[PDB]
Amino acid sequence: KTNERPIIGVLAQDVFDPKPDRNSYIAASYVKFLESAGARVVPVMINKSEDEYSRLFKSINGVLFPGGGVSLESSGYSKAAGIFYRLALEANSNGDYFPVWGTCLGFELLTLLTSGELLLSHTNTSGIALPLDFTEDVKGSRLFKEFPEELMKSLATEPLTENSHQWSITTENFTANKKLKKFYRVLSTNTDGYNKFVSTMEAYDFPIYATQWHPEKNAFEWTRPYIPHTPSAIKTTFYMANFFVNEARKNLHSFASTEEEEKALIYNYKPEYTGIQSAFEQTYFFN
Amino acid sequence: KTNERPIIGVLAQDVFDPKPDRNSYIAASYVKFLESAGARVVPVMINKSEDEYSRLFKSINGVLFPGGGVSLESSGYSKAAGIFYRLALEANSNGDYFPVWGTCLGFELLTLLTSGELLLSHTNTSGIALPLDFTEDVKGSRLFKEFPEELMKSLATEPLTENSHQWSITTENFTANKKLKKFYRVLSTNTDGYNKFVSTMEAYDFPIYATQWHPEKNAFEWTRPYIPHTPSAIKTTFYMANFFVNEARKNLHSFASTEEEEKALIYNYKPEYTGIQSAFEQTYFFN
Amino acid sequence: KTNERPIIGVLAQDVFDPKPDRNSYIAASYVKFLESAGARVVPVMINKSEDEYSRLFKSINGVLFPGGGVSLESSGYSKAAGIFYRLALEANSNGDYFPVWGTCLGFELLTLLTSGELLLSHTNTSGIALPLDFTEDVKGSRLFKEFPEELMKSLATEPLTENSHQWSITTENFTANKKLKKFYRVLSTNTDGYNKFVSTMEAYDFPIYATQWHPEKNAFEWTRPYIPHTPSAIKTTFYMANFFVNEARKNLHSFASTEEEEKALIYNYKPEYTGIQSAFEQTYFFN
Amino acid sequence: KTNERPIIGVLAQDVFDPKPDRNSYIAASYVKFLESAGARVVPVMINKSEDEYSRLFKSINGVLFPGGGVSLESSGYSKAAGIFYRLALEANSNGDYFPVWGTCLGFELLTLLTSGELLLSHTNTSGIALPLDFTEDVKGSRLFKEFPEELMKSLATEPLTENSHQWSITTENFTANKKLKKFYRVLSTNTDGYNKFVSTMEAYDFPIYATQWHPEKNAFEWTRPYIPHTPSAIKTTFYMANFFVNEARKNLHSFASTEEEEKALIYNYKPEYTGIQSAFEQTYFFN
Amino acid sequence: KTNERPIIGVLAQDVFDPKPDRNSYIAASYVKFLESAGARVVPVMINKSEDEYSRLFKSINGVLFPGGGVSLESSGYSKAAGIFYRLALEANSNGDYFPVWGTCLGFELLTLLTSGELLLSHTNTSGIALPLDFTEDVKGSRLFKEFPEELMKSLATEPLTENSHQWSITTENFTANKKLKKFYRVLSTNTDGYNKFVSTMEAYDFPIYATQWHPEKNAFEWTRPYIPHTPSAIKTTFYMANFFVNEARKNLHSFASTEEEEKALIYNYKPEYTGIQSAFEQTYFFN
Amino acid sequence: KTNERPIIGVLAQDVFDPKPDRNSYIAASYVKFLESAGARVVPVMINKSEDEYSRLFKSINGVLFPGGGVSLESSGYSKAAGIFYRLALEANSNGDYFPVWGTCLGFELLTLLTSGELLLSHTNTSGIALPLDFTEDVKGSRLFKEFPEELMKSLATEPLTENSHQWSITTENFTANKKLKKFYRVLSTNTDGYNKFVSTMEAYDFPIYATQWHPEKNAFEWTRPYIPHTPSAIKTTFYMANFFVNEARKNLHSFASTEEEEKALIYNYKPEYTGIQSAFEQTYFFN
């Protein structure tokens, strides 16, 4: 019994010096990530009412909190991400299956929403491709259950994952925190040469996945030199999103009416070519 | 010796009532098809000069000829497709590996370009999802070499391939044509219950590939009920693109300057929201 | 003993926009179909009582359930057919040989009436002429016993049978239904390229015969390009009607008043020229 | 090269007490006879200009002169028939293959048209069903070449041919006439016990066919006891028409437009229910 | 030894509407038939005892059974004719030469009496004048021995013999019945174009003669157009009657007294003029 | 051109002792004589105006004047026969062919009518059968032209002609009269022993025939021992009547309506059985 028309919320985030028509943004590569695995996409605006997110939550089939650079405590992004997290946790234990994806900044907020503590520390990972260093919990995991055995060996040995974060959470800072330990299964770690930090994780009891690294960049962003683009980096982006969309198909929510749908979809927006100098080749800007 | 930053051209084609800023178009799903496998895309304009096309040809790493409804003999599309075909044979013959993909109309165009003759018959395939009746020659094929065995079985038995064409070449007419028969290995057939036609083929001595069906739709088009959207149909569209792009990574062509490259890319254009009424969610219109 | 003045009822069917003198209709080609094999025809009105249909049933020699688009459960067509079907079983079981013929929508009602369930799937068969794929069971069959050999060869390989149905029963669903499996001998199947469905059948124990296709159109309908008209397509319409009318020659009912016979006969109605627009050259409408 | 949309003209004949809208008539059994063999019908009106008969002649694929009881010398029927006869002889000798069929009155008119004389004698043949007494010349013959052998045997021995004429041409008067004997191959005779008379004939060098009996009655007329209705009578009517209409599929005339076609067809007219009184169930009356 | 004053009984038959003085009738043409060949006539009454019949038989020189339409199995006519039939067989086997003549109904009754079965079929022979189709067996037959040759040739070719019967015995049924084959020499046959039947016979070993046709009508009945009246038809009636009376001359019976002879003779009755309505100019009616 | 329904007048004759309904008479044997040769008979009444005879004359096709014993000069018989004789002479000279037959008394009238004188004398001929003494002129003759040559030899050698007359014209008396001798060819003579008399004649220039004997009696009259009854005598009465009626077939008069035809015929009358007493079995008596 399945939803073969999934639609996924992707969270917008506060623009640095915000102006009308430029209050928040989404890099296009997050939209491509999901569409390529057979989902459609709805942007989730910054600074809306609790009721408004609650309407949309009940309409859409999952949410993704993208990476980026805004505050985890006082941004529109952080507030909205917080409502979805809470709504998502509520729906799942009611047996309404609703998955959540955290990427970089999104992963970092998930550690803050779950523990209630800002546990992040600097790492030299602002711009570098890395393999993954898997833990022993990987064999049992949901996230990587359908990855070809050969992609998994490639993951562990080749620099297939984009890192472009100044903050990470450390293996020790993670194990120490009671709340995180008992909530999230760690699936991979990484080192920056001095610090060993958590790189991919999934919740024991909820469809919540997070990567400190950017699975969306390998196939879709080309403006920096630390973005891997080898065939097996391309496959990695597909299989990561393929698993996530496959999670959203377990969700049966749907828009009230289909004209409502048409008006919510990312196809109403046109992104600009931000590639000549930004890290994003294209970005969507929202009032 | 590979090119891990491939750029693929996609042929625009003639709009029916050609007003300016609207003389040709590309269904965005063809762009998504290719980006998602880790290429970038350049739209190939509709009514340019042999010199202009060979300059684009010399900068790019492959071409795709999309489906559509435009004349196979007298359209801007048809003429420019001919030029690109001519140049690809020549390049390939000189050790310069350049791949060609044709979908639906492109595939139809390829039968004409290589046989020299218009060999198409009516078929009742305007909006049906079909499995592929593989031939014996799939066993050694280039195109399907990397497909997982599971997905090959799914393709033989499930309605994973979308058919939205009025014309096909029957297998009878393909076989009797000595030029097609010598040039192309047939990988699959299909039928409409009376006419048996060629559905997927690859060139024996050249990286030319072609499907009567539309691999790009499964992941990216949602407005028509004969577009398959199951997990296996989603894999299908990735694995089809993944093969084509891996072929383009064997090409070494590049742009004269990365200024000029920047001005060629599809990112320079905004597609229009066409999904309310049309078979495409998004279409790029060009002057 | 035989009846050489057989009279066969044809069932009228509900008009999409019912007015007076226009509540129901019979496409003229059904009447021509039976007349040409040497029967007379009585149209069977739609919204009548169980009781009036027995009086009509006792006077006639056969019934036929035409194709069309009306409801299989809630229509007056569906109710009246149900009554005739039951009347027919009782009668045959008591040594009163009474044959029933179903075409397109009538073949479909026959599956529902004998199985007790709706087992139909969408097929892409709205406007194509097909050969018949004969089962191994044609060799014994009643329906095809007097077809000339060459005609049977022609029918196996030439597009001689008109298909214009949105629904079918797949051979899967047929075979999984014990009641259908035990009741109907399958004489031919067809495909639309994915779905394989039953296209001709006869009951093992009852003079009940059904085609998913329209044998009546080849000789008598001219306004769509998927109706075949080669000489063997014409013989096909004659040999099909001839079999069924020779079945009716086995029933010894008669009208008790030669005066009411005179007033029930199709000759009291005049059909209108619907051919400029309709798939039907002529159509009888009834109050 | 063949015409699979044949259209055959049927001549109307003068009504005995002519009134507005009841000037001429066609018995509907002649319409049905031709439709059942896969032709469409055009009623040819009786008192029209020579340019109009020429326009109709050049549009249709054959002509039939029906039975009845109007004058062979001075009726609108006879003048129009003589025009069509002369058009057909000219067209056929010019390589434009055009068949002509004469039934009862039309057969008698053919003897007069081709001999230039009235050579008829009274015979006791109003009302009776007769076998055919085939001549030696049946063996080579065109008319009967596709009849099953067993139907030929039934024809030779069972009362399958409806006779309802007061006049015949005797075999003696036929052979004595130099023109008849040279023009027409005799296929069958019959006898009323005293007069032996020509019953079936075909022109040696022209596609001109003629029966003294009424092949169209068996399947379609039910109001007189001397109309045969056995299974093999019904096949007689089919095979007779089938042969003639296959003659018309050799003629490649077409109407000037599909609109002119539409306007000429018998579907513009509605027959009267005439069967309680007359030997015809239905009859088309024309102004 | 010869009887030159022959007296022949003609059997009366039941009126369809029995009333006093009108229970049986003889058409006068049968009396005139006999008289004109030089016989006198006694009407033979219908509802009499075996004894009354025996006494009459012994007195007369011959008997004739006329045509008409009463029952062959259950009328006064049929029972009386049976008696005479057995009496004549008995007399003739004992050298008492006694002729019997059966016309129409009489001819049919003879087939029943001698075969013991009802073997008759409908033929289209109620109103027509026919030649005789003589068998080889006429060659030395008794009936025609004294016919002039010129007359025999006219009878073979000209319509000299009056047919007005609904029933006949076919050639096939005559020759299949052993008793009839043994007993009757077939002199002529006739056909209505389908049924071939026996038209004149004579007993091999008995002076029993029969015609299915009516030789007495030609000279004496003027009420119908199918009675021949040419000169050789008049000759036919005379020679037919001449032969039968020359047979009766070989019989030597006489009446006991000449008063009884006088009371027996047709002369005691006066016929009625029935020519305005019926087929008979004059009919004798008896109580 | 002939008349094959001929109607012949027979003149009635004065009764001896006249009563009401008994003023005139005709022996039925003259009626049977003519019917037996295929004519109908009109009795011609005795005492009627010239205009009634002219009407009747113009209606009928011939006239017979019978034998008997009434005045040749002053009876109604004789006056009416004179009228008929004169009209018949006038019609014949104007090409209206009208034959007249005289028997015995009528023969004698004719000698009187054509000579203008009474030239009869006694002969011993009141009751004897005689052969004919043919003249050399019978070879020329019209009367006997169609008699079989064996009948001619019989008539000349056997007592075939009944004589029942008291008067004759001797041959001497015939030949002496210049009028008779130019008018009539003597066909036969006879002798009574002493007197040689004219017994058969026919006119050279008109169809008038006369016998002094009674051809009618041989087949029809049985009450006198000098009436011959041998098969030849029977044939004699047929061939004599046959010739006369064939003369009447050359005449084309008809009645002015069928109604009047019907009222004139002998069928309106019933004769009396006079056989116990008279030379006449049956006689019609008229008022």
CA distance A81 to A105: 11
> SS3 string of D131-160?
CCEECHHHCCCCCCCCCCHHHHHHHHHCCC
Q: Which two tokens stand for residue C261?
A: 């016979």
Tokens of D262: 């539409």
Contact (CB<8Å) E192/D128: yes
A68: left (phi over 0), alpha (psi -120 to 50) or beta: left
C190 shares contact with chain B (CB less than 8 Å): yes
User: Chain centroid to CA F240: how far?
Assistant: 10
A131 in reach of chain B (CB within 8 A): no
Encoding tokens for residue D165? 């004429």
Which residues partner with E284 through β-bridges? Answer: E26
Q: In angstroms, rounded to a whole number, what is the distance separating the alpha carbons of residues D231 and D218?
A: 10
The answer to whether residue C278 neighbours chain B at the CB level (below 8 Å) is no
Three-state SS at A258: helix
Between chains, do E193 and D190 touch, taking CB under 8 Å as contact? yes
Distance of alpha carbon E24 from the chain centroid: 17
**Where would I find the H helices in chain F?**
28-36, 50-59, 76-93, 105-115, 149-157, 171-176, 178-183, 217-220, 231-248, 258-264
Q: Domain of F229: which CATH number?
A: 3.40.50.880
Please indicate if any CB of chain A lies within 8 Å of the CB of B32: yes
Q: Record the tokens describing residue E168, joined without a space.
A: 């006949």
The encoded tokens of residue E170 equal 């076919």
Integer-rounded Cα radius of gyration of chain F: 18
Closest CA to C43 of C26, C58, C27, C57: C26
End-to-end Cα spacing for chain B? 38
Q: Residues followed by a break in chain F, C–N over 2.5 Å?
A: none
Which tokens go with E93?
A: 């086997």
Q: Which phi and psi angles does D64 have, rounded to 5°?
A: -125, 130
Gap between the Cα atoms of C243 and F127, Å rounded? 86
Q: Scan for tokens 């092949």, then name that residue.
A: D215
SS3 F19: strand
Residue of A122, A165, A214, A253 marked catalytic:
A214
Which is catalytic among the residues D122, D165, D214, D229?
D214
Do F228 and F159 form a contact (C-beta atoms < 8 A)?
yes
Instruction: Tell me the two tokens of residue E77.
Output: 């006519």
F121 vs chain E: nearest CA distance in angstroms?
33
Which residues lie closer than 8 Å to E159 by C-beta, 6 or more apart? D194, E128, E129, E130, E131, E228
- The whole-angstrom distance between residue B10's C-alpha and the CA centroid of its chain comes to 9
d(CA E33, CA E211): 14
Whether C3 has its CB under 8 Å from any CB of chain B: the answer is no
In 3D, which of D246, C283, D69, D31 has the Cα closest to residue D44? D31
Contact in structure between C41 and C5 (CB atoms under 8 Å): no
Tokens at B90, concatenated:
């020549």
Active site residue F214: yes
CA distance D158 to D153: 8
Catalytic residue among C122, C214, C229, C253: C214
Residues C14 and C70: beta-carbon distance below 8 Å: yes
Inter-chain touch B38–A219, beta carbons under 8 Å: yes
F260 in E contact zone (CB under 8 Å)? no
Whole-angstrom distance, CA of residue F204 vs CA of residue F46:
29
Distance of residue B181 Cα from the nearest chain A Cα, in angstroms = 33
Residues present in chain F in total: 287
Task: Fill in the amino acid letter for D227.
Answer: I
Radius of gyration of chain E (CA): 18
Helix axes F105-115 and F76-93, enclosed angle (nearest 10): 60
F246:E235 CB<8 A: no
Q: Angle at Cα E32 formed by Cα E27 and Cα E38, nearest 5°?
A: 145
B127–chain C Cβ distance below 8 A for any pair? yes
How many angstroms separate the first and last alpha carbons of chain F? Answer: 38
A260 CB near a chain B CB, below 8 Å?
A: no
Closest residue to D40, CB basis, from C5, C36, C222: C222
Identify each DSSP E strand in D52-183 by its residue range.
Answer: 62-65, 100-103, 121-130, 133-134, 161-168
State phi, psi for E198 to the nearest 5 degrees.
-85, 130
Nearest to E131, CA basis, from D197, D193, D133? D193
∠ CA A254-A257-A259 to the nearest 5 degrees?
120
CA distance E222 to B165: 85
Which residues from F are below 8 Å from E266, CB to CB? none
- C100-103 and C208-211 as β-strands: parallel, antiparallel, unpaired? parallel
E235 in reach of chain F (CB within 8 A): yes
* 8 A C-beta contact, residue E141 and residue E201: no
Distance from CA of C171 to the nearest CA of B (A): 15
* Burial degree of B142 (CB within 10 A; 0-12, 13-18, 19+): middle
Binary contact (C36, D282; C-beta < 8 A): no
Select from D101, D22, D87, D19 the least CA-distant residue to D55. Answer: D87
Residues of A in contact with B218 (CB under 8 A): 38
The CA distance from F156 to C25, in Å, is 93
B179: which DSSP letter? H
CB D225 within 8 A of CB D153: no
Contact B242 A222 (CB under 8 A): no
Question: Listing from the earlier edge strand, what are the strands of the sheet with F13-19?
Answer: F13-19, F22-27, F282-286, F272-273
Under an 8 A CB cutoff, do C193 and B130 touch?
yes
Q: Work out whether strand E184-191 and strand E40-44 pair parallel, antiparallel, or are unpaired.
A: unpaired
| C100 touches C65 (CB < 8 A) | yes
Nearest to C220 by CA among F213, A39, D265, B216: D265
CA-to-CA separations, F91 to B280, F51, F87, F94, F115, in angstroms, rounded: 111, 16, 6, 5, 20
Look at residues D93, D67, D110 and name the one whose alpha carbon lies nearest to residue D214. Answer: D67
Amino acid code (one letter) for E27: A
Resolution (A): 2.1
Provide the Cα torsion C60, C65, C68, C70; round to 10°.
90
Instruction: Give the range of the structural domain holding residue B24, as residue numbers without chain letter.
Output: 1-287
Rounded Cα distance, F64 and F71, in Å: 17
Cα–Cα distance, E171 to E161 (Å, whole number): 19
Give the 3-state secondary structure of residue E280.
coil
Distance separating alpha carbons of residues E168 and E152, to the nearest angstrom:
23
Distance, in Å, from the CA atom of A1 to the CA atom of B14, rounded to the nearest integer, reads 43
- Chain D residue numbers with beta carbons less than 8 Å from the beta carbon of C273 are 267-268
Phi then psi for residue D19, to 5 deg, are -130, 160
The alpha carbon of residue C232 is apart from the nearest alpha carbon of chain D, in Å, by 10
**Rounded to whole angstroms, how far apart are CA atoms D111 and D167?**
12
Distances in whole angstroms, Cα of residue E124 to Cα of each of D127, E133, E170: 9, 17, 12
Q: CB–CB of E53/E81 below 8 Å?
A: no
Residues of D whose CB is below 8 A from E164: none
Asked if E230 reaches chain D (Cβ–Cβ under 8 Å), the answer is no
> What are the C-alpha distances in Å from B94 to residues B90, B91, B110, B206, F125?
6, 5, 21, 12, 147
E208-211, strands of its sheet edge to edge:
E40-44, E7-11, E63-65, E100-103, E208-211, E196-203, E184-191, E133-134
> Is the CB of E140 inside 8 Å of chain D's CB atoms?
no
Phi, psi of D283 (to 5 degrees): -145, 135
Alpha-carbon distance C123 to nearest alpha carbon in chain B (angstroms): 9
Picking from C165, C253, C179, the residue whose alpha carbon sits closest to that of residue C217 is C165
Q: Do chains E and F touch (3 or more CB pairs under 8 A)?
A: yes
Nearest to C14 by CA among C59, C51, C44: C44
Helices D231-248, D28-35: inter-axial angle, 10-degree rounding? 70
Chain B interface includes C128 (CB < 8 A):
yes
Tally: H helices and E strands in chain B: 10, 14
Say yes or no for a CB contact (<8 Å) between F219 and E32: no
Structure tokens of B195? 């006419």
Among the listed residues E102, E8, E31, the one whose alpha carbon sits nearest the alpha carbon of residue E283: E31
DSSP state of E268: G
Residues sharing a CB contact under 8 Å with residue A49, sequence separation 6 or more, in sequence order: none
Task: Please answer yes or no on whether F219 and E271 come within 8 Å at the CB atom.
Answer: no
Residue C116 has a CB neighbour count (10 Å cut-off) of 10
Alpha carbon distance B200, B156 (integer Å): 13
Sheet bearing A22-27, strands edge to edge? A13-19, A22-27, A282-286, A272-273
What type of residue sits at position F221? E
What is the nearest CA distance from D246 to chain C, expressed in angstroms? Answer: 8
CA-CA-CA-CA torsion for F66, F67, F70, F76, nearest 10 degrees?
A: 10
Instruction: With beta carbons under 8 A apart, name residues in chain C contacting D267.
Output: 273, 275, 281-282
Contact C81, C108 (CB under 8 A): no
Of B125, B129, B191, the CB nearest to C191: B191
At which residue do the structure tokens 């999309």 appear? B66
Task: Output the 3-class SS for E71-140.
Answer: CCCCCHHHHHHHHHHHHHHHHHHCCCCCCEEEECHHHHHHHHHHHCCCCCEEEEEEEEEECCEECHHHCC
Tokens of B100: 């060609």
Q: How far, in Å, CA of C85 to CA of C91, rounded?
A: 10
- How far apart are alpha carbons C214 and C240 in whole angstroms? 10
Taken as a whole, chain B contains a residue count of: 287
Q: Is the dihedral of CA F211, F215, F221, F224 positive or negative?
A: positive
Q: CB-CB: which of D130, D131, D194 is closest to E130?
A: D194
User: What is the rounded CA–CA span in Å between residue D201 and residue D138?
Assistant: 9
Of C36, C230, C273, which to mutate for an interface test with D (greatest number of D Cβ within 10 Å)?
A: C36
* Method for this entry: X-ray
| Bridge partners, A284 (sequence order) | A26
CA distance C162 to chain D (A): 15
Expressed in angstroms, the distance from the first to the final Cα of chain D is 38
**Among C5, C268, C275, beta carbon nearest to D273:** C268
Instruction: Compute CA distances A91 → A3, A17, A114, whole Å.
Output: 17, 36, 16
Q: Which of residues 69-98 of D touch C (CB under 8 A)?
A: none
In angstroms, the CA B106 to CA B111 distance is: 9
Radius of gyration of chain D, Cα coordinates, nearest whole angstrom: 18
Query: D18: part of which helix (H) or strand (E)?
Result: strand D13-19
* Interface contact flag, D193 E194, Cβ < 8 Å: no
- Which of F32, F235, F270 is closest, CB to CB, to E35? F32
Structure tokens at F17: 């002792």
Nearest CA among F239, F134, F148, F145 for reference residue F187: F134
**Quick one: how far is CA A97 from the chain centroid?**
17
Q: Which amino acid is at E61?
A: N
Q: How far is A183 from chain B (nearest CA, A)?
A: 29
C210-243 as b/e, with b when 16 or more CB fall inside 10 Å? bbbbbbbbbbbbbeeebbbbbbbbbbbbbbbbbb
- Which residues, at least 6 apart from C68, have a Cβ–Cβ distance to it below 8 Å? C13, C27, C77, C104, C105
The neighbour count for residue C74, using CB atoms within 10 Å, is 10
CA angle A186, A189, A194 (to 5 degrees): 140
* Three-state secondary structure of chain C: CCCCCCEEEEECEEEEEEECCEEEEEEHHHHHHHHHCCCEEEEECCCCCHHHHHHHHHHCCEEEECCCCCCCCCCHHHHHHHHHHHHHHHHHHCCCCCCEEEECHHHHHHHHHHHCCCCCEEEEEEEEEECCEECHHHCCCCCCCCCCHHHHHHHHHCCCEEEEEEEECEHHHHHCCHHHHHHEEEEEEEECCCCEEEEEEEECCCCEEEECCCCCHHHHCCCCCCCCCCHHHHHHHHHHHHHHHHHHCCCCCCCCCHHHHHHHCHHHCCCEECCCCCCCCEEEEEC
Rounded Cα distance between A38 and C218, Å, is: 45
- Beta bridge partners, F128, equal F163
Check CB contact of C242 with chain D, cutoff 8 Å: yes
- Give yes or no: A122 in active site: no
Cα end-to-end span (Å), chain E: 38
From chain E, pick out residues whose CB is under 8 angstroms from the CB of F278: none
Number of compact structural domains in chain A: 1
Residue A207: what residue type? Answer: P
Q: Are strands E282-286 and A100-103 parallel, antiparallel or unpaired?
A: unpaired
Structure-token pair, residue A153: 């060996």
F151 and chain E in contact, CB less than 8 A: no
Q: If DSSP states are collapsed to H, E and C, what string results for A45-110? A: CCCCCHHHHHHHHHHCCCEEECCCCCCCCCCHHHHHHHHHHHHHHHHHHCCCCCCEEEECHHHHHH
Chain centre to alpha carbon of residue A207: 12
